[PDB]
Amino acid sequence: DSIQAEEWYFGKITRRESERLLLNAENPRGTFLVRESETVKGAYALSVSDFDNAKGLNVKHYLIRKLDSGGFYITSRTQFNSLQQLVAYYSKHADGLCHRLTTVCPTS
């Protein structure tokens, strides 16, 4: 219910720590977590593992903007009522991300 109950929500971890977790060679492409943004107060970040044609294993970080009127988005064109709904949506199809969300980042 609250975001804090979701196994993909890691809260106030650093971008560096998210990378350490996501760059595990065992994680399938599109392994992910959501964290608080370090750069934009009150925003979130969706951190996603990828295999880049030139850089190999890498992590992409997408800013999730938060509306004071309610709602969340990576793009203002595609808005959600919750982080849970955004996660569900990007889990179905990439729709602009590097890859669809496939696997909740194994803990640590």
Method: X-ray
Distance, in Å, from the CA atom of 59 to the CA atom of 62, rounded to the nearest integer, reads 10
Tokens of 88: 């569900």
Alpha-carbon distance of 48 to 1, in angstroms, equals 23
Assign residue 74 the CATH number of its domain. Answer: 3.30.505.10
Phi, psi (degrees; rounded to nearest 5) at 42? 90, -10
Decide: 42 and 66 in contact? Cβ < 8 Å.
yes
Helix or strand run (H / E) with residue 7: none
**C-alpha–C-alpha distance, residues 31 and 69, integer Å:** 30
Token pair for 55 = 């850089």
Task: Tell me the residue range of the domain where 108 lies.
Answer: 1-108
Domains identified in the chain, total number = 1
Q: Which of 83, 18, 93, 16 is nearest to 44 (CA)?
A: 83
What's the residue count for the chain? 108
The label of the residue with tokens 């295999």 reads 51
Q: Which residues of 25-57 are buried (b: 16+ CB within 10 A; e: fewer)?
A: eebeebbbbbbbbeeeeeebbbbbbbeeeeeee
Resolution reached, in Å?
1.8
For 86, the 3-state DSSP assignment is helix
- For residue 3, which of 59, 42, 58 has the smallest C-alpha distance? 42
**Beta pairing class for 44-52 and 56-66:** antiparallel
